[PDB]
Antibody, heavy 216, light 216 residues
Framework: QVQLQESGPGLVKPSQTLSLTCTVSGYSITSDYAWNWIRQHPGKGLEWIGYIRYSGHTGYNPSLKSRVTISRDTSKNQFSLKLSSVTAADTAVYYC?????????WGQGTLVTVSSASTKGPSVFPLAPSSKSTSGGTAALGCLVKDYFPEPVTVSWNSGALTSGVHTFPAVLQSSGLYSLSSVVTVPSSSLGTQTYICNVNHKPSNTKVDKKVEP | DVVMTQSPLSLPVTLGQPASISCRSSQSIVYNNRYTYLEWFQQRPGQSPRLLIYGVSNRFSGVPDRFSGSGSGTDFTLKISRVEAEDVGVYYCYQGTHAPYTFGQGTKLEIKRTVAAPSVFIFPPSDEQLKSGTASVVCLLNNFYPREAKVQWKVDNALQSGNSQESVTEQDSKDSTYSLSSTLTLSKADYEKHKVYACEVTHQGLSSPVTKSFNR
């Protein structure tokens, strides 16, 4: 029944101080155990950062010790990481985790991009089912999510209703330095017109939420 | 520091067959001869790591009993008796004995399965995207195996190069196939200049290359 959840800024500018917070549900930070921060360089392995005990004591990975502090707010059942003077090497997914002799419960992770650039919401274009997708049994349709920064973007279909057959691709970098991805779904050709398909895109750093409906 | 070394780095496994992952620490990670702090985690794409095994041999509650861990000293091992489709992911070992606590570099579990030809679709750019000045044409390759595919773009029978980028999904947790998108990006300017837009897929599952196209 334990839940951990990381919250923080998805974007931080170089040399600034990165600040993350973990909120624990269903167990008290004060009772027992050591509460940890771990990060994961994109497309790479995991690095242990440090912990704060139930007692408030702390220990850190020497590779980052001189730039970090961990601390807690017992009255909110939160504990936090602060990483000072960040660079691009500190771009990673950051994980909250409990250590009971081992890491049992983890948070979902938040991605942190260290960049000088400004947040940019995405354009959303429909991927239109053309007549050859139509003539067979099944037809393909989707959403193109273009020109955004930073990661990540969140796509669903019909607000969660549609899951089967849905492929949301990994974002690719464009030569414009901006991200772009596609999300596509396979559906029975007969249901077109009968059934409406909307892709629900959410890009939090630009506070963008689009709901484009795809028809031909 | 203590260096955890895993082997192999990528591990192909026929579905339903066994698999074993070796993790070797550069020093002893036994605490006092009383206990050894070694864990095994599984990480599925886009998810936080999941605990599988703690203290070398103990299976975490909830973990399917086809997972087991063993070893002692500097040489440990994780085993899957019968691999199932959802087992696909990356697996890390972790030493909690000597600070700074460290992870392995990960072993990627790839599921081998029978060759599967892709279902190909082509998408012409939305009217909307066109007004805004650019043209993105999308070719979808859906549910295929193996990963290696060759997508060639041909505009009015002329072969493109340097103006398209691919994106590939991870192995599907159910059917172990891949999906791929190739996006051709052109200025609205360079787009009107041509009529025939072709996508030519070459894959093991196809006897002859498949081409999906359109005009405008």
């Amino acid at each position: 029944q334990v839940q951990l959840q990381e919250s923080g800024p998805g974007l931080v500018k170089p040399s600034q101080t990165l600040s993350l917070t973990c909120t624990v549900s269903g167990y008290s930070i004060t009772s027992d155990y050591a509460w940890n921060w771990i990060r994961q360089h994109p497309g790479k392995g995991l690095e242990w950062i440090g912990y704060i005990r139930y007692s408030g004591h702390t220990g850190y990975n020497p590779s980052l010790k001189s730039r970090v502090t961990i601390s807690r707010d017992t009255s909110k059942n939160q504990f936090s990481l602060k990483l000072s003077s960040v660079t691009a090497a500190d771009t990673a997914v950051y994980y909250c985790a409990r250590w009971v002799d081992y890491f049992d419960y983890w948070g979902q992770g938040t991605l942190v991009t260290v960049s000088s650039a400004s947040t940019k919401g995405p354009s959303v274009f429909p991927l239109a089912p053309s007549s050859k997708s139509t003539s067979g049994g099944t037809a393909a349709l989707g959403c193109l999510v273009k020109d955004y920064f930073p990661e990540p973007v969140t796509v669903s279909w019909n607000s969660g209703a549609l899951t089967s057959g849905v492929h949301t691709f990994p974002a690719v970098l464009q030569s414009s330095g901006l991200y772009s991805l596609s999300s596509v779904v396979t559906v029975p050709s007969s249901s077109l017109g009968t059934q409406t398909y909307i892709c629900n895109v959410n890009h939090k750093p630009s506070n963008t939420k689009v709901d484009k409906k795809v028809e031909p | 520091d203590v260096v955890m070394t895993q082997s192999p780095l990528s591990l192909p496994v026929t579905l339903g067959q066994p698999a074993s992952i070796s993790c070797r620490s550069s020093q002893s990670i036994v605490y006092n001869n009383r206990y050894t702090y070694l864990e095994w985690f599984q990480q599925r794409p886009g998810q936080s790591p999941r605990l599988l095994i703690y203290g070398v041999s103990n299976r975490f509650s909830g973990v399917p009993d086809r997972f087991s861990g063993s070893g002692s000293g500097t040489d440990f091992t994780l085993k899957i008796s019968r691999v199932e489709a959802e087992d696909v992911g990356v697996y890390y070992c972790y030493q909690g004995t000597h600070a700074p606590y460290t992870f392995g570099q990960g072993t990627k579990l790839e599921i081998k399965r029978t060759v599967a030809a892709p279902s190909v679709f082509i998408f012409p750019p939305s009217d909307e995207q066109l007004k805004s000045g650019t043209a993105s044409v999308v070719c979808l390759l859906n549910n295929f195996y193996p990963r290696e595919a060759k997508v060639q773009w041909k505009v009015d029978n002329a072969l493109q190069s340097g103006n398209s980028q691919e994106s590939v999904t991870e192995q599907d947790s159910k059917d172990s196939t891949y999906s791929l998108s190739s996006t051709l990006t052109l200025s609205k300017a360079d787009y009107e200049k041509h009529k025939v837009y072709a996508c030519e897929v070459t894959h093991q599952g196809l006897s002859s290359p498949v081409t999906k196209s359109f005009n405008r």
